[PDB]
Amino acid sequence: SMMQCGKCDRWVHSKCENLSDEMYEILSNLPESVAYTCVNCTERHVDGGSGGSGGSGGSATTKRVLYVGGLAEEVDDKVLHAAFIPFGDITDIQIPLDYETEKHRGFAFVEFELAEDAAAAIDNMNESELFGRTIRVNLA
């Protein structure tokens, strides 16, 4: 009843669906080590005085995508969306999954429709316990 084809000159899925330049550049060009860390180093972050960032700068508001790591393997896109939904409206959740293993490593990125809620999510749950594990959130 159904006919199948072997060789295909053009792709139907790629033509019909496409990914944004912002999500593609951040996810594809991310550092293999920075994407996931097992041991914490004091050299990267050090405690000092009350100042540091200053009056201007420090945090960016131009990006609406945030990094979220430290989740459980049994967590789905629905879980990440519904957990970060109280802060604002969310567009899409991406989880780097391999075709061979089809397994999750406990980290993903979140896309926020509003830039104000995005900055709110980072200031409220930057280092909080979710699903029984510690998570980290920052600008992507």
UniProtKB/Swiss-Prot annotation:
Changing residue 105 to A: No effect on interaction with KMT2A. Changing residue 103 to A: No effect on interaction with KMT2A. Changing residue 67 to A: Decreased affinity for RNA. Changing residue 109 to D: Abolishes interaction with KMT2A. Abolishes inhibition of KMT2A activity. Found in all the examined tissues including heart, brain, placenta, lung, liver, skeletal muscle, kidney and pancreas. Residues 64-140 form the RRM domain. It is found in: Nucleus. Changing residue 97 to A: Decreased affinity for KMT2A. Involved in pre-mRNA splicing as component of the spliceosome. Combines RNA-binding and PPIase activities. Binds mRNA and has a preference for single-stranded RNA molecules with poly-A and poly-U stretches, suggesting it binds to the poly(A)-region in the 3'-UTR of mRNA molecules. Catalyzes the cis-trans isomerization of proline imidic peptide bonds in proteins. Inhibits KMT2A activity; this requires proline isomerase activity. Belongs to the cyclophilin-type PPIase family. PPIase E subfamily. Identified in the spliceosome C complex. Component of the XAB2 complex, a multimeric protein complex composed of XAB2, PRPF19, AQR, ZNF830, ISY1, and PPIE. Identified in a pentameric intron-binding (IB) complex composed of AQR, XAB2, ISY1, ZNF830 and PPIE that is incorporated into the spliceosome as a preassembled complex. The IB complex does not contain PRPF19. Interacts (via RNA-binding domain) with KMT2A (via the third PHD-type zinc-finger). The RRM domain mediates both interaction with RNA and with KMT2A (via the third PHD-type zinc-finger), but has much higher affinity for the KMT2A PHD-type zinc-finger. This is Peptidyl-prolyl cis-trans isomerase E. It comes from Homo sapiens. The chain holds residues 2 to 82 of 301 of the full protein.
